Amino acid sequence: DIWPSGGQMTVKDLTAKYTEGGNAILENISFSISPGQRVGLLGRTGSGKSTLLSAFLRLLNTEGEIQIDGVSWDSITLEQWRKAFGVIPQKVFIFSGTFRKNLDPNAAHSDQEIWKVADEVGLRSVIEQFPGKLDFVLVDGGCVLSHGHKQLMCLARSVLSKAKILLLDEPSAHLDPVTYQIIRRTLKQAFADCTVILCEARIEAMLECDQFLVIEENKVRQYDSILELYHYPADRFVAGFIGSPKMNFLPVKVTATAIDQVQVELPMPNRQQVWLPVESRDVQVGANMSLGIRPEHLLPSDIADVILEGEVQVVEQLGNETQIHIQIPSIRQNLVYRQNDVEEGATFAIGLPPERCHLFREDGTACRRLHKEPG
């Protein structure tokens, strides 16, 4: 019975605590990942991203149920459970002995097998320089190896162990550029049909994810696509994460609610009234809100019904896009406008489309957008 098989993982009310009598960083967490899914892990500074990955490996006091391919984490040994995962970057353990042993601790592999994995992870040349090749003894914690060499050995170890779930704890951050690329290369090659949990600080190097997993305060929401994350951020953090330049935020007051709508007024001496195709639940009339609108979605003057005007402070020419920073006097703040593929000072005018406005409460959470964006 070859385990793991696909890479599917289910989580039921997970509680991760560092000390037996400490404080729980993750209260009660449930989710499920389909086999062979590349999942982006997101969260605010300190929310518990690294802790989740540490809880997967059971490296702290853990309560609840984790299951890979319908097998619980309670009827299997730590080292067997950890063999299912390929963790890089990793606290590198280089064992006392030879290259062969460090790659194949169980002695369960042919020398030809070891060389094959070594070659595909770029270790062939690293091993060859040393007298005994595979027979060469690695002294003093593997002090002849660079940081990257050591990570490639952890990786090779996992390819050889045939791991099925990969835990990338900010790889681009903690790796050599030359090492990091090989990791991405073997990711689409050796671990092509594997669950990958990419955790990083920038969406630029997460652009290829089928799924996302964002850590809230108590729950973990999961977005089925980049499109979902872009159009329907369930909080103000997620709204700022995707799309550049950042989403414009406007302070607004709720003048009215409805059944499936919310009305707000602009913060300005112009204080205009506008309805928003946004969920009405948990919205008290009079409350303070933050209206979100992307620079991408802002219409030109001649187009919309709700119009704004101001003097241009910055015209940023990038070639494939043009960024217009408009200092609007009506509203006491700037408004960044954008359009695909006009100098500083002159009066610009932008239209704000109610259909594509996000709405955020004081706490940060978003009122669900009801407008159905195609795709």
Residue 48 binds ligand B44, judged by CB under 6 A: yes
Quick one: angle between helices 177-189 and 147-161, nearest 10?
10
Distance CA 244, CA 232 (A): 16
Amino acid letter for position 85: F
Q: Which of 223, 239, 260 is nearest to 39 (CA)?
A: 223
Nearest 5°: phi and psi at 360? -120, 135
Residue 18 binds ligand B44, judged by CB under 6 A: yes
Among 9, 33, 40, 51, indicate the residue that binds ligand B44 (CB under 6 A): 51
236 is in an annotated binding site: no
Residue 149 vs residues 121, 129, 141, 168, 181: alpha-carbon distances, Å: 10, 13, 12, 17, 13
Distance CA 216, CA 313 (A): 36
Residue 45 binds ligand B44, judged by CB under 6 A: yes
Q: How far is the CB of 232 from ligand B44 (least distance, A)?
A: 22
Residue 43 binds ligand B44, judged by CB under 6 A: yes
Distance CA 252, CA 175 (A): 44
Binding span for ligand B44 by CB under 6 A among 53-61, 123-131, 183-191, 340-348 = 53-61
Radius of gyration of the chain (CA): 26
Residue 60 binds ligand B44, judged by CB under 6 A: yes
45 is in an annotated binding site: yes
Chain-centroid distance, C-alpha 185: 20
Residue 25 binds ligand B44, judged by CB under 6 A: yes
Residue with Cβ nearer ligand B44 (22 or 97): 22
Distance CA 225, CA 96 (A): 45
Q: Identify residues 213-252 at the interface with ligand B44 (CB under 6 A).
A: none
CA triplet 27, 29, 32: central angle to 5 degrees?
170
Residue with Cβ nearer ligand B44 (18 or 95): 18
46 is in an annotated binding site: yes
Residue 77 binds ligand B44, judged by CB under 6 A: no
Q: How far is the CB of 297 from ligand B44 (least distance, A)?
A: 29
Q: How far is the CB of 112 from ligand B44 (least distance, A)?
A: 37
Site string for ligand B44, 250-289 (x = CB under 6 A): ----------------------------------------
Residue 61 binds ligand B44, judged by CB under 6 A: no
Q: How far is the CB of 60 from ligand B44 (least distance, A)?
A: 5
Binding span for ligand B44 by CB under 6 A among 41-49, 266-274, 319-327, 358-366 = 41-49
Which two three-digit tokens encode residue 201?
Answer: 């600080």
Q: Say if residues 306 and 285 touch (Cβ distance below 8 Å).
A: no
Q: Which of 138, 139, 141 is nearest to 127 (CA)?
A: 138
Q: After which residues is the chain broken (C to N over 2.5 A)?
A: 341
Residue with Cβ nearer ligand B44 (24 or 349): 24
Residue 47 binds ligand B44, judged by CB under 6 A: yes
Residue 178 vs residues 117, 125, 198, 291: alpha-carbon distances, Å: 18, 14, 18, 43
Chain-centroid distance, C-alpha 211: 9
Residue 54 binds ligand B44, judged by CB under 6 A: yes
Distance CA 344, CA 325 (A): 9
Among 2, 20, 46, 177, indicate the residue that binds ligand B44 (CB under 6 A): 46
Residue 93 binds ligand B44, judged by CB under 6 A: no
Residue with Cβ nearer ligand B44 (14 or 127): 14
Residue with Cβ nearer ligand B44 (60 or 137): 60
Residue 49 binds ligand B44, judged by CB under 6 A: yes
Annotated binding-site positions for ATP: 18, 43-50
Per CB under 6 A, residues contacting ligand B44 are 18, 25, 43, 45-51, 54, 59-60
